[PDB]
Design a binder for these strands. Structure first.
Ligand SMILES: NC(=O)c1ccc[n+]([C@@H]2O[C@H](COP(=O)([O-])OP(=O)(O)OC[C@H]3O[C@@H](n4cnc5c(N)ncnc54)[C@H](O)[C@@H]3O)[C@@H](O)[C@H]2O)c1
Ligand SMILES: [K+]
Ligand SMILES: [K+]
Ligand SMILES: [K+]
Ligand SMILES: [Mg+2]
Ligand SMILES: [Mg+2]
Ligand SMILES: [Mg+2]
Ligand SMILES: [Mg+2]
Ligand SMILES: [Mg+2]
Ligand SMILES: [Mg+2]
Ligand SMILES: [Mg+2]
Ligand SMILES: [Mg+2]
Ligand SMILES: [Mg+2]
Ligand SMILES: [Mg+2]
Ligand SMILES: [Mg+2]
Ligand SMILES: [Mg+2]
Ligand SMILES: [Mg+2]
Ligand SMILES: [Mg+2]
Ligand SMILES: [Mg+2]
Ligand SMILES: [Mg+2]
Ligand SMILES: [Mg+2]
Ligand SMILES: [Mg+2]
Lengths: 171, 71, 118
RNA sequence: AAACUCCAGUUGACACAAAAUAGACUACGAAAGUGGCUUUAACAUAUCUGAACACACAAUAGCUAAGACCCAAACUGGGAUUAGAUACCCCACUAUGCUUAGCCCUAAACCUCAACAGUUAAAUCAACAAAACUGCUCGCCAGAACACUACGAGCCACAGCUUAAAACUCAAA
């Protein structure tokens, strides 16, 4: 998070803000503001680090950055409020909306898609091809079918050496 | 409107709940037997797999779990 | 943010009232608050009897403290006021002067048809 | 009648319960829901549509465990009415309504109006409801009853929920 001494986004570019009393600097800092003001500083930090034009707020890049800041705020909220179903819904919806944005950014501008993923720490994932319950009967059988395959592979290799050994003896 | 369609469903549900009440001990014995066969049918399906793959016994360290018991 | 502490103090003599206010303003400063003003609203009869700290009160000293503090200071200050035996009732609200009132053109009528249908 | 008579009245002290008036308002929220006070956090998406099953929710009742307990209250006990029993009435009291941590996943969960976009000119239009329609998409339907059923399958559900037939029968529904 930005330091508490950080000035608000509105007062950072006023002339002479560095020569005012320390008390006036505290009243214009993040320490004396609500969390929404700290998120505006985070968004601006990501916008200048990532996007080519930090003042274009309607680009697909800026929307992903703005939404990524909201997603982090919901995660922090839910870390303290674990039974808040309303905000749990907003988080899952926001994550899904960001994935849709990333899909559209990957399809249109891959070079920018890569910088967004590096800058925001997003690991893009392709969706599963099928949506179906993995119930106990299927989970157990799939585990057995993988064990059966693994054992069959071992036996097929021990039928290569014995055949190889016998062939050498003939010589 | 009238509620005649609701009334038919009401009586059907009442008689069903009444039938289930009277026979809840027979139905519990029947359900238990079905789950036993269901477990056996599941165990056979897994044994069929390793047998059709050329193995003679279950994969080393494999025990088929009971996936239908209340526990 | 900017807050307003509505403070009802036990009816006391001037020396104990000043000691309570100083002790209360220092608690705000210790928690990071920047105190802006202190207003005396006067001693008056309470609108009802208030029991606080094993005592019954019928009169109190009404004071206001306008101050800025971090959002985390409110919870800690509310706890402090609950333990001060000379404080009858202390509430922290967001300062009313921060909220800017939106202009009003006037009273637009609401149609009777909307009243019923809605 | 029973019950109570450490009863009732005044006064004072005193809540893990519930939130007059405002509210003749029609707001917030995806819905369910949400009307005492304060503060903190906070109410997704710069094209729309998109799921019985994926993901996350979901009144009331109910389950498991631990607490609280004013009042209410299935059940139960007592009194009364009754030919008599149950109910309706009275008294007492419990599960439960509350909190916490897990479940359960239902409603006439209904504005009984799917989402989005557009139109008020044509014919206004079976009827009633709620003026009549267009584009587009998903979901769903194809006589009644059998049937919120049977079987199968899944599920922390075990007298449960979800999905959901057929045979026999009828000329209606
Ligand atoms: N079944 C899938 O995993 C899957 C994958 C891609 C697309 N779809 C699309 O979903 C729609 C539903 O297909 P259906 O009628 O054969 O399925 P269905 O509704 O009969 O459901 C059967 C299975 O598909 C899943 N499913 C249902 N609706 C889905 C949806 N909208 N998207 C993804 N999975 C869904 C269910 O959870 C279940 O596992 C179709 O438009 C299909 O093209 C389904
Ligand atoms: K109230
Ligand atoms: K009211
Ligand atoms: K209705
Ligand atoms: Mg019937
Ligand atoms: Mg008597
Ligand atoms: Mg959608
Ligand atoms: Mg489907
Ligand atoms: Mg749906
Ligand atoms: Mg359902
Ligand atoms: Mg529920
Ligand atoms: Mg409960
Ligand atoms: Mg009582
Ligand atoms: Mg009780
Ligand atoms: Mg309560
Ligand atoms: Mg409702
Ligand atoms: Mg839809
Ligand atoms: Mg007509
Ligand atoms: Mg039919
Ligand atoms: Mg039902
Ligand atoms: Mg059923
Ligand atoms: Mg069954």
């Amino acid at each position: 998070d930005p330091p508490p001494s950080t000035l608000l986004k509105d007062y950072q570019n006023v002339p002479g803000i560095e020569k005012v009393d320390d008390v006036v600097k505290r009243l214009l800092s993040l320490e004396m503001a609500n969390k929404k003001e700290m998120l505006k500083i985070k968004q601006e930090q990501f916008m200048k680090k990532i996007v080519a034009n930090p003042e274009d707020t309607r680009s697909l890049e800026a929307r992903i950055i703005a939404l990524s800041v909201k997603i982090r705020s919901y995660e922090e909220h839910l870390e303290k409020h674990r039974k808040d179903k309303a905000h749990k819904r907003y988080l899952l919806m926001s994550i899904d909306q960001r994935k849709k944005m990333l899909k559209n950014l990957r399809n249109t501008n891959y070079d920018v898609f890569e910088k967004i993923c590096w800058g925001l720490g997003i690991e893009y994932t392709f969706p599963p091809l099928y949506y179906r319950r993995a119930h106990r009967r299927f989970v157990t059988k799939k585990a057995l079918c993988i064990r059966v395959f693994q054992e069959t592979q071992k036996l097929k290799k021990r039928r290569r050496a014995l055949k190889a050994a016998a062939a050498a003896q003939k010589q | 409107k009238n509620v005649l369609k609701i009334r038919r469903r009401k009586m059907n549900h009442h008689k069903y709940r009444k039938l289930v009440k009277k026979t809840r001990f027979l139905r519990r014995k029947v359900q238990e037997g079905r789950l036993r066969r269901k477990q056996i049918k599941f165990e056979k399906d897994l044994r069929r797999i390793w047998l059709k793959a050329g193995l003679k016994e279950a994969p080393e360290g494999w025990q088929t779990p009971k996936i239908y018991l209340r526990g | 943010p900017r807050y307003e502490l509505a403070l009802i103090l036990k009816a006391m003599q001037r020396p104990e009232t000043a000691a309570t206010l100083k002790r209360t303003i220092e608690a705000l400063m210790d928690r990071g608050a920047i105190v802006r003003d202190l207003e005396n609203l006067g001693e008056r009869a309470l609108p009802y009897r208030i029991s606080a700290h094993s005592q019954q009160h019928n009169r109190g000293g009404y004071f206001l403290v306008d101050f800025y503090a971090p959002t985390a200071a409110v919870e800690s200050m509310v706890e402090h006021l609950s333990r001060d035996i000379d404080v009858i009732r202390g509430n922290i609200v967001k300062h009313p002067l921060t909220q800017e009132l939106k202009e009003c053109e006037g009273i637009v009528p609401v149609p009777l048809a909307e009243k019923l249908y809605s």
